[PDB]
Every structure is written in C-alpha cells, then in structure tokens.
Design a protein around this ligand. Structure first.
Ligand SMILES: Cc1ccc(C(=O)Nc2cccc(N3CCOCC3)c2)cc1-c1ccc2c(C3CCNCC3)noc2c1
Length: 347
C-alpha cells in the first residue's frame, strides 16, 4: 500500500515525503541533489533523505540516476552505505519525476576525526582495516569508488566506518584542493584505462594522513602533485612507461629528472614498521603491482582485526546496462521499476 505523503518547502525546494519521515532538516546541497536529516518514526532511526535534482533532465543524468539506485540497492555490507528506503510521490510511471533515497544518517567524517582527534596506531589499524574490508566487498562487485577521500568516510563514536559518496568538472580538480589529493596518478593525468587499483592508491594516501595528521600529497595543481608523488615513490621505469598509453603523458613524464624511491621509514618517522611496509605496497606507481584489498586484509599490520570468515564478498552484480544506449524515458522506466521493486532491510 502507498503511504500518505506530505509537502514542505525546504530552501526553495519542494519535499514530498511519506508521513513516517519527520523533522526534515537541510544538511547538504548541490547540482545533482540535496539532503535532509530526518527521523523515521517507523524504525526509530535517524536518517538522511536525498532528493535527486533533475534526475531525468538528460540521457547522462537519467543513466546516472539509474546507476546510483542500482548500486545502493545492491550494497549490503557493514562498511558500505546501504539503502533503507527509496520512494517517489508519483502514482504512475507517467507522473514519475522525482526520486528520494533514504539511508542511515552519518555523523562525523574522517576529516573531522583527523583534524580534531589524535589517532593511535590501533585507531589507524581499525580504520584502515574497515576501509579495506568495505573495498574488498565493493571491488568483488566490480564497482570502483574512484573518489575515496576522508570526506567520503563516515565514522561513528565507536570508530566504526562506512564508505559512501557524498558527491553532489575540470575546475573542481584545479589548484590546491582536496578533490585531487587522494587520486591515483593514472586517473589524475589520464595515463591509461584505469581499474579498481585506483582505490588502493587513495587508501594509501588516507592511511599516511591518519599516521601523520597531514595530507600526503597536497599538490598546488596536477603537476606539482605529480612532482610530490614522484619525489616519494620514485620516477617511473621503462616497464611502467610502456604501459602509459597516452603518448602525450608518457613523453611528459620522461622529461623529468630520474629520482629514486625514498626511504618510507624516514618519511613516516616512528610509525609501526608494518604500517610502513603496507604503505610501500599500496603507494606503487604501477597499478598492476599495487596490493589489492583482499591481499591487504591478510597483511600482518591487521593481525588484531583480520577474520577471514567475516570478510564477505558481494552477490553477483549485473552492470551490463553500463554499455547500453537508451532514451531518457527508457532509463526513466528502468529506474521506476527499481523504485517499486525495492524491499527494505529485514528486521
Ligand atoms: C542520502 C544518501 C544517498 C546516497 C548516498 C551515496 O553515498 N551515494 C553513492 C553514489 C555513488 C557511489 C556510491 N558508492 C558508495 C560505496 O562505494 C562505492 C560507490 C554511493 C549518500 C547519501 C547521504 C548523503 C548525506 C548524508 C549525511 C550528512 C552528511 C553531511 N552532514 C550531515 C549528515 N549523513 O548520511 C548521509 C547519506
């Protein structure tokens, strides 16, 4: 049965939501949507409700909407954001125009943690362990995050962590900006077809920052950031160079004065030697040679937390739609089907 909906205006946006959701309060806004904290009187949960902005305005938007809903419907893991509810006030496909996504409400992110709290090695162990546990799951579904950074990691009072994407442009990657500091170099400079290993670079950057309290590669721009990276990990060898399929990027990087990999024990002074070893295995320029999430979970750094019987993989995820070309109304109808077939988390 369809719940009763009620309307309010929230910062010149109409919100039409089921009665069960009360105390809506704006908490984040951007081009692709806006978010309210709410109270789900049905479950007694504090929730976030995201109203997608212009979900079907173009083929690109419509496909992105379908993409996010498919992803959130699939993700069922303790360290990965999941979907409590999805709804539309529309009574039919014909009048369908708005999509609302409901999740648990997150409190602090890892930026807040790193900026305000000081982290012991045990804290770093636990936090990184949970990122990798979540990544193992996400990667098993052949989902790449591509934008892992402290602001996309939510951490509760008990130091329990969830991976999400709060993403709501070339300009946005420009300059001295945290939007670029955690990106794998192959994606930052469009070196080649990239894959899930990009996320492991990001984890290396986050981990280093938990250990030092400071950004690892706070580049003032793409080139300055590359120079910071190469100063630490060394300039690429011939083997990696032949893998850089962009002939332009390859020729640029070859123009740089060769530099050796630095001693990581002298960069991360006082750090657990096992953390040093792990960082060396994550922060490898050749993405083919980076440690994977599944491999990293078995690294001795995580001995206290690693449980091979409680590090689950995802159910098969069909993303054949990614290579499909459809019209707006066809993406819209697929998205509609997914809204009406949603089944909330049990108990
Ligand atoms: C409501 C909502 C819906 C969807 C998403 C959301 O994370 N969507 C999304 C989109 C694309 C990719 C992924 N991935 C995550 C897992 O890794 C693979 C890729 C996830 C996120 C939220 C969301 C947004 C804001 C908040 C907040 C606020 C954050 C800002 N301050 C107050 C709380 N709490 O909880 C929230 C959930």
């Amino acid at each position: 049965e369809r719940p009763t909906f009620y309307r309010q205006e929230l910062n010149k946006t109409i919100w039409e939501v089921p009665e069960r959701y009360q105390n809506l309060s704006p908490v984040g806004s951007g081009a692709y949507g806006s978010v309210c904290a709410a109270f789900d009187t049905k479950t007694g949960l504090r929730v976030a409700v995201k109203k997608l902005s212009r979900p079907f305005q173009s083929i690109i938007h419509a496909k992105r909407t379908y993409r996010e809903l498919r992803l959130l419907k699939h993700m069922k893991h303790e360290n990965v954001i999941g979907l409590l509810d999805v709804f539309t006030p529309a009574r039919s496909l014909e009048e369908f125009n708005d999509v609302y996504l409901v999740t648990h409400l997150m409190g602090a992110d890892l930026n807040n943690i790193v900026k305000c709290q000081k982290l012991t090695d045990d804290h770093v162990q636990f936090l990184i362990y949970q990122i990798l546990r979540g990544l193992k799951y996400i990667h098993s579904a052949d989902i790449i995050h591509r934008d892992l950074k402290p602001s996309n990691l939510a951490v509760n009072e008990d130091c329990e962590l969830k991976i999400l994407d709060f993403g709501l442009t070339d300009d946005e990657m420009t300059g001295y900006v945290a939007t670029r500091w955690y990106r794998a170099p192959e994606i930052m400079l469009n070196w080649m077809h990239y894959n899930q290993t990009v996320d492991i670079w990001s984890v290396g950057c986050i981990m280093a920052e938990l250990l030092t309290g400071r950004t690892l590669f706070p580049g003032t721009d793409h080139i300055d950031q590359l120079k910071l990276i190469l100063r630490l990990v060394g300039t690429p060898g011939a083997e990696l160079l032949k893998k850089i399929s962009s002939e332009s990027a390859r020729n640029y990087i070859q123009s740089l004065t060769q530099m050796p990999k630095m001693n990581f024990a002298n960069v991360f002074i006082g750090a657990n030697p096992l953390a040093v070893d792990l960082l060396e295995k994550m922060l490898v320029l050749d993405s083919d040679k980076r440690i994977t999430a599944a491999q990293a979970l078995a690294h001795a750094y995580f001995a206290q937390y690693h449980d091979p019987d409680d590090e689950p993989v995802a159910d098969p995820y069909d993303q054949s739609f990614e290579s499909r070309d459809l019209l707006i109304d066809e993406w819209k109808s697929l998205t509609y089907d997914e809204v009406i077939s949603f089944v909330p988390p049990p108990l």
